[PDB]
Amino acid sequence: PNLTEISKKITESNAVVLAVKEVETLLASIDELATKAIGKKIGNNGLEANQSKNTSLLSGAYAISDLIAEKLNVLKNEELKEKIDTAKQCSTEFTNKLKSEHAVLGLDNLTDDNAQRAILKKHANKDKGAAELEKLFKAVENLSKAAQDTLKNAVKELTSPIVA
Amino acid sequence: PNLTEISKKITESNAVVLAVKEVETLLASIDELATKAIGKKIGNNGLEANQSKNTSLLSGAYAISDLIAEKLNVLKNEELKEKIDTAKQCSTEFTNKLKSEHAVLGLDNLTDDNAQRAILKKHANKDKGAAELEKLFKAVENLSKAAQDTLKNAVKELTSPIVA
């Protein structure tokens, strides 16, 4: 089958899957910060309660959001360009929302509720980033599905006839 | 070549590469927190100075370290078991070091220097986690190389004769 030169199709469609997972995992880390570290402090047993001091925690989410923008800014693939752009745009709006809410997410005694309105996707109130975060989550999700299936083709069209 | 059933060898040796990258990216996020968010606050322009308030930031690193342990705890592969175990062990010691230093990393006005001694690998002083973090970094790095090369085999042995 094409001298099985499907390798190039498999190695490259893979570098995409890899690149996107990275962005995926970075979102998952922000979500871990959100669901596990908000209003918490490092305790002798592990994490425990410490409310209204999520300022630096928020700076961490922002940082990871910047790294996320960087990654997408460099993700290049013609057939996927679409899904990549929307993801990139969501990335921007999410980072931009946090920024505009700097007067609160940047103030020292940041309360948990306010933090969650910024980085906790399932929070009842999402008027400080969560909403945008959510969309960034979905965008990357579809960008992922789109690339993962592409990979499966190059791999599965290995145990199929040549041409059609 | 083995009815090109190398697919199974490629799809599986890939699920390993994927799983490990995830763990890799999680370390990279902790490092981003370390090199970009310590002693910072979300500002109208982006991140800016705000020293001695890295408590919640540290809770985030701890959280991501817990998620990291979880991932490795579930990473299973016979031929790699070795490199996986050492990584898992480094994971434990790193998380355990942060925990034992809870009296400082869990106190509200955590100074930047103290934070960096915990999660900044290149810091001059690494007596609060950095040292362990570093090792966790190297362990996963080798676990990665080991799996990535494995993948290349299953892919490259696609454009090579059957058997030997």
TrEMBL record, chains A, B:
The keyword Membrane applies. GO terms for cellular component: cell outer membrane. Keywords: Cell outer membrane, Lipoprotein, Membrane, Palmitate, Signal. Its main location: membrane. The keyword Lipoprotein applies. It comes from the Bacteria. It is found in: Cell outer membrane. It is a lipid-anchor. Coiled coil: none annotated. This is Outer surface protein C. It comes from Borreliella burgdorferi (Lyme disease spirochete). The chain holds residues 30 to 192 of 192 of the full protein.
